[PDB]
Amino acid sequence: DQLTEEQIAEFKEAFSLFDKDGDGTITTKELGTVMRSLGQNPTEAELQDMINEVDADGNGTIDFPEFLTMMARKMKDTDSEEEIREAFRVFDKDGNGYISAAELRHVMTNLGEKLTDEEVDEMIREADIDGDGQVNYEEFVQMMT
Amino acid sequence: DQLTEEQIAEFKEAFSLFDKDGDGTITTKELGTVMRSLGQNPTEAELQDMINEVDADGNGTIDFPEFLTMMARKMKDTDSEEEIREAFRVFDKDGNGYISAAELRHVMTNLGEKLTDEEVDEMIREADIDGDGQVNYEEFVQMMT
Amino acid sequence: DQLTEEQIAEFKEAFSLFDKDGDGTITTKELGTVMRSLGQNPTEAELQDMINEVDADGNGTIDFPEFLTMMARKMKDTDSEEEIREAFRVFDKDGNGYISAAELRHVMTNLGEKLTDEEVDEMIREADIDGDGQVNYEEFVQMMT
Amino acid sequence: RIQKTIRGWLLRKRYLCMQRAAITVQRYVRGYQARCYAKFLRRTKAAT
């Protein structure tokens, strides 16, 4: 039962990691870091526009209540399993839920705004990959939502 | 119904510090301390769960065989150095060989199992640290081993 | 059996050393002295517990029957015969039964109720110490008994 | 949407691992303090 006071307790926990002076405030510079640590998923430009709506300098601070405003703003605009499945499905050569591990690297590191060497190394160590073949993406839909 | 004989001896050794009457029982508040004295490191949560397997009373006590026959149903597994050394290697992801005492203070206070300021000040005092605040986590583990 | 006439005579002689009027009262400062002169074995904090019933700052006065009332309960308490061995067991140098002189300075002058300089002299002369050294605790218990 | 999802999940997984690692250290630290206080208690009782 989302956005009840229980869920706001872990939002205070994760916020307290970045309120290093301990006054109820965090910098704009880590706002994406805390939101994605809590597992809510904004894009880069979206986050930057949400920061620059608060300050044209971009370099500033946000108090705990208005951090909860920014969390609620993203929660109103949340994805779904079928919307994430659609994003993988345009790359499906067969139509069976599988995508090439070669073309996956092209999608991760050449197309779009891209994933870094660290993000690639971390994900590839857990995924255990040594090849370029077809691999199931319905797992990705479930596990990353 | 019991732990293996060599562990009964160490449990009797520990329990002798917490009996206050010489009559084989302990007042309910001492229960967490005696358990952590064994070398096992249960969470606050594990100690709160364990009370539901014990059936304690605020108008009563826990006898030596009541405590031992609880442990004979289930006890906490043995905590060894390499678990804690691996936990430090989560934080030092880039392999620098050290951690800032200020970062360590903030994280150990304001996240997870949450050490109070009394607990954190004594924790920082027991560590080995280079002359500008760089904590030598390997040597700190060695001094507890 | 408690309180044959001769018991009261022996205990009243020990008290009559300290009263300087013959009115049946002493200063609270000598309460520990008369008690230990008869070989009764309380802690300083155990004397302090009783003194909170009678003294404004540690300079008051107290009757023979008040002293004898405290003594009457202390005379049914245990002789510390097991307790003193449990105590010395902690300060053994290597597990063969021998207390180290270094540990013994911390036991005399740091831990607990301590000892003052001119009565630490007494223990050094009792033990014949002119440098580094040790003492057997079963023999030393036998001597203090 | 893919890059966003992967980047989000990696940060989610790293936060969960960080909190687990913190709890793992903190429980051991609170255990070492409990053992040091037990050591202090037996030594202070014994000396007294």
Characteristics:
part of a larger assembly; 4 chains; A: 145 residues; mainly alpha; Recoverin, domain 1; 2 domains; two-stranded antiparallel ribbon; 8 helices; 8% strand; elongated; D: 48 residues; rod-shaped; motor protein; myosin
Question: Can you walk through the features of this model?
Answer:
This is part of a larger assembly, with three copies of chain A (145 residues) and one copy of chain D (48 residues). Chain A is mainly α and 145 residues long. Chain A has two domains: 3-77, Recoverin, domain 1 (Orthogonal Bundle); 78-145, EF-hand (Recoverin, domain 1). Chain A has helices spanning 5-16, 31-37, 44-52, 64-75, 81-89, 101-109, 117-127, 138-144; strands at 25-27, 61-63, 98-100, 134-136. A two-stranded antiparallel sheet of chain A has the order 1-2. The radius of gyration of chain A is 18 Å and the shape is elongated. Chain D is an all-alpha fold and 48 residues long. Helices cover 96% and strands 0% of the residues of chain D. Chain D has one helix and no strands. Chain D has one helix spanning 2-47. The longest helix of chain D is centred in the middle third of the chain and has 46 residues, at 2-47. The radius of gyration of chain D is 21 Å and the shape is rod-shaped. The chains are: A mainly alpha (145), D mainly alpha (48). Chains B and D meet through helix 2, helix 5 and helix 7 of B and helix 1 of D.
